Design a protein around this ligand. Structure first.
Ligand SMILES: [Fe+3]
Ligand SMILES: [Fe+3]
Ligand SMILES: [Mg+2]
Ligand SMILES: [Mg+2]
Lengths: 423, 423
């Protein structure tokens, strides 16, 4: 079994480091004064970057891999997506959900993702997708720690038996309580739905992740209730507000007042760049707003924010290979986090900040933690992002669970020359 | 003791008038058909304007005189102001508050101000500033009638024990119940805080003065709740909405609907020109809104509105000499009340309208009232405002409590010539 990771670079640290492993955990981390020789039981990072695993804080595994079945979304709109999904209803079975979820999970394992939070639609009396996902969670456990959010997609108060079904999902084992206040019939139902969500989270000791203000409506302010209730209950660390795309459209004075509460509350925020740029701004003609939440300002204020993929290869988002560096690339561009340090520090948005969002208790390259880490064939976060590098090795419990042999590119000039896209 | 004020001009009246004094009160007011001779016990207004005392309806004596201690606010922003104040915390003592409050009160006495309403931060378990201000109120009584507002600066529902501290302040003697709904964590806390404020005012028979919608947010509409609750309780005369700067940003249709209620409710409004032009519009780039409430429209609709200085020589407003004619000058410009009559009638915004805001029962040059009046060396309100004249004499209880010997300016041309800035 592997005993050491050598010649590793660490974000924010100078030089090379050696990570000692024992009994599936990291026993010690020591600085090197030069390059160490390889040997039996040593995994050579080759001066590449070593980081804790990538994290997917927001994905819908119940709908993944269904694009084009039975028909393709040709307009690309949300409206048509709903119609295309409806045409596939006859194929939505226990086994179908498990097969598709596992296909995307394998791409995630290949991409160094060891922690995933999936929302599962529980606005279904049969709870078909939820029952399937609970089995998938157990099956994939050796490779990925999967959290399941009971997501009442059609609303809690605006759908028949919505609250009873949400609670049933928690009784069956869902890890997180979801909500979608802006989709409820009225603002009052929206606010009330959040009180019910928090009461359920406290009753069952579960986390909360709300699809919050995902709409280009400057009056959609459910985020202040999410933060206020979290502050009142002293549970900010266990609470997440996903999307908050309406914040992109708020006036600055209200946003400034709100930020004081967001910081005090300690809640987490998830932005989903690939999907937000695609589905937001659809009611504008020109100019067209970007529609991503205030990521740059959150970072400047010390508010925890991170990035999710949201959807993969389905009616709502036809693209994706479940790659977090690709999600990060889009977010840095749309949010204009394009200075060198902003890009280099970008890795935090898909590693540490996401681990905090999932309330993980065993995460990070530190002595005593499980030996879960990945190796990128790049010098730092900037280099990894610019070249969109694959994950050379993914290690979990001190064992290799994925590896990618890099592509090899050659140009035939006066003589053959290898191209690695470095200067 | 003084027995008469002679050769006085009165706003809106033709000619000169004689004001007879007896036992500290105004016994009678009689018109003169010409200029009266001076004599023992007669104070000669010298055809200057005589008016009841200036009033300061909104000031923060607990923070006054602290600019630059220990450091100056260099950006001039609200954010930096909060930080600069925090650096002075070690100096905030009982004696410090009394010393600074008294310094500004002396400037006010010098400026003919005999009525002052100060807000005091009661979001402090030790209520240090409040205890100091209650002593200052007693000490300054011979010269100024000071009203104290228990101002829950950090919110009523959004600060630990906020409501209990607000009530404690009333039990200690604060004259007015304050609130700040737009600063509460949520809109619901904002509305609820107003119900609590009104309940306390009725329980203790106190006035109300709310820091209301002081934010460039077109959705901040707490003013309608303040007016509706006042109308319901039949207590409009005892209620004031300070700032209402959000009203500057409302659409016209909602404002028109709202105005019917504002008039019916009978509540008072305070605009703070020097501070509002400075702190509002800070989130705009260009064009930049003025951010003062709808003063001109309130006047046209018969809604009582008046002007306050707000802050004097502190982190939030570095300037000021506590001069009401200077406050009026700024308000007339920013609110575009620049026609001759609008400027001339401007004095009402710092005298009669402010007295109504403070619910004063002994105010005005009328027989039976206490002999509290001031003399301006000007022909009318327009002239006093244009030349920013000092207060020649301030009389309280029939005795002179302040006087200013005017500056004397000379230009040396072919011969020396006195310049008084009159044409
Ligand atoms: Fe989602
Ligand atoms: Fe104030
Ligand atoms: Mg979605
Ligand atoms: Mg203020």
């Amino acid at each position: 079994a592997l005993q050491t990771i050598i010649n590793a670079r660490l974000p924010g640290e100078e030089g090379l480091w050696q990570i000692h492993l024992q009994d599936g955990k990291i026993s010690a981390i020591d600085a090197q004064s030069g390059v160490m020789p390889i040997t039996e039981n040593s995994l050579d990072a080759e001066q590449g970057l070593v980081i804790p695993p990538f994290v997917e804080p927001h994905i819908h595994l119940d709908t993944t891999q269904t694009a084009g079945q039975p028909n393709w979304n040709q307009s690309g709109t949300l409206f048509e997506g709903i119609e295309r999904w409806a045409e596939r209803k006859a194929l939505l079975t226990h086994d179908d959900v498990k097969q598709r979820a596992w296909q995307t999970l394998k791409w995630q394992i290949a991409n160094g993702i060891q922690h995933v939070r999936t929302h599962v639609d529980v606005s279904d009396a049969t709870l078909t997708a939820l029952k399937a996902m609970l089995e998938v969670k157990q099956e994939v456990a050796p490779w990925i720690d999967l959290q399941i959010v009971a997501f009442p997609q059609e609303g809690i108060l605006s759908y028949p038996n919505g609250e009873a079904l949400l609670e049933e999902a928690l009784r069956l084992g869902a890890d997180v309580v979801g909500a979608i206040p802006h989709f409820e019939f009225t603002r009052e139902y929206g606010v009330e739905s959040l009180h019910k969500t928090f009461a359920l989270a406290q009753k069952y000791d579960r986390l909360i992740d709300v699809h919050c203000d995902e709409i280009d409506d400057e009056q959609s302010r459910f985020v202040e209730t999410v933060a206020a209730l979290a502050h009142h209950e002293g549970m900010g660390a266990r609470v997440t507000a996903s999307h908050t795309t309406a914040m992109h459209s708020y006036n600055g004075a209200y946003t400034s007042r709100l930020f004081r509460l967001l910081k005090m509350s300690g809640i987490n925020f998830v932005a989903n760049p690939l999907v937000n740029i695609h589905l937001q701004g659809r009611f504008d003609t020109y100019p067209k707003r970007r529609g991503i939440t205030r990521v740059k300002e959150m970072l400047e204020s010390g508010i925890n924010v991170c990035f999710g993929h949201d959807s993969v290869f389905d009616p709502w988002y036809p693209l994706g290979t479940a790659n977090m560096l690709q999600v990060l690339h889009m977010g840095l561009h749309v949010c204009q986090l394009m200075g060198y340090g902003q890009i280099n520090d970008g890795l935090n948005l898909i590693t540490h900040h996401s681990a905090r969002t999932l309330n993980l208790q065993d995460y990070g390259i530190a002595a005593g933690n499980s030996a879960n880490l990945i190796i990128l064939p790049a010098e730092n976060g900037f280099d990894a992002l610019r070249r969109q590098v694959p994950v050379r090795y993914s290690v979990r419990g001190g064992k290799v669970i994925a590896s990618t042999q890099p592509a090899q590119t050659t140009v035939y000039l006066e003589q053959p020359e290898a191209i690695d896209y470095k200067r």
